[PDB]
């Protein structure tokens, strides 16, 4: 056992927004000096494609190389659940190594999005929590972000998606804002991207009462 291979999927935002370029990354490590030559072959659904980029091998601090091949993918094939196959072949590999990956299969379920105001108890602090519950969606690939007056608010943290008991996923996204902004009735918004949503997108807003 010399080399080792890892296939990574595209970023959720990149698969969802037609204007970003989504890509699957194949990464070979423990590439001996003795045998540096590495061949990458890609197949979408068992049919080989040939426009993958192979970044020049870069050198690791433990006397091994690392080589990565990157295949950029069509937003549709990915959302249609097509299968990406990376085959790494090396002169010191008993046989070429195969890793294949893809989006999860399952009828896409649209998320429900709820914004929730800060707890009354929280309104003693000088900063508050604006909350965004997003649940019911499938598969787990989603992206969430907040904004106000068409400007991104950047002091938010979001949860990894959690598996609910009816087999879909939910998550929360917590936006911290200065209390005063909230009390003055500014309006904030939770943006959500997901394939099962119409045009991959929905937005929910909240503000004081």
């Amino acid at each position: 056992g010399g080399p080792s291979v890892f296939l990574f999927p595209p970023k959720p935002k990149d698969t969802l927004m037609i204007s970003r370029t989504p890509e699957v990354t194949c990464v070979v490590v423990d590439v001996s000096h003795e045998d540096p030559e590495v061949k990458f072959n890609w197949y979408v659904d068992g049919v080989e494609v040939h426009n993958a980029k192979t970044k020049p091998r870069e050198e690791q601090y433990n006397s091994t190389y690392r080589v990565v091949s990157v295949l950029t993918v069509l937003h549709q094939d990915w959302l249609n659940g097509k299968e990406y196959k990376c085959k790494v072949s090396n002169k010191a590999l008993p046989a070429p190594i195969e890793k294949t990956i893809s989006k999860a299969k399952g009828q896409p379920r649209e998320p429900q999005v709820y914004t929730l105001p800060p707890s009354r108890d929280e309104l003693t602090k000088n900063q508050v929590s604006l909350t965004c519950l997003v649940k019911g969606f499938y598969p787990s690939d989603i992206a969430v972000e907040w904004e106000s007056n068409g400007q991104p608010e950047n002091n938010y943290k979001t949860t990894p998606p959690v598996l609910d008991s009816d087999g879909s996923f939910f998550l929360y996204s917590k936006l911290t804002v200065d209390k005063s902004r909230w009390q003055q009735g500014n309006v904030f918004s939770c943006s959500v991207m997901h394939e099962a949503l119409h045009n991959h997108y929905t937005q929910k807003s909240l503000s004081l009462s």
Binding site: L16, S19, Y201
Partner: peptide, 29 residues
């Protein structure tokens, strides 16, 4: 119809009179 996120095109669809759905509008994208 089309959706925009902070000025960036997200996706766009149209009505396809046949089926009750909005299919991906590839022309526009």
């Amino acid at each position: 119809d089309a959706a925009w996120h902070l000025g960036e095109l997200v996706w766009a669809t149209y009505y396809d009179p046949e089926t009750g759905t909005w299919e991906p509008d590839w022309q526009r994208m």
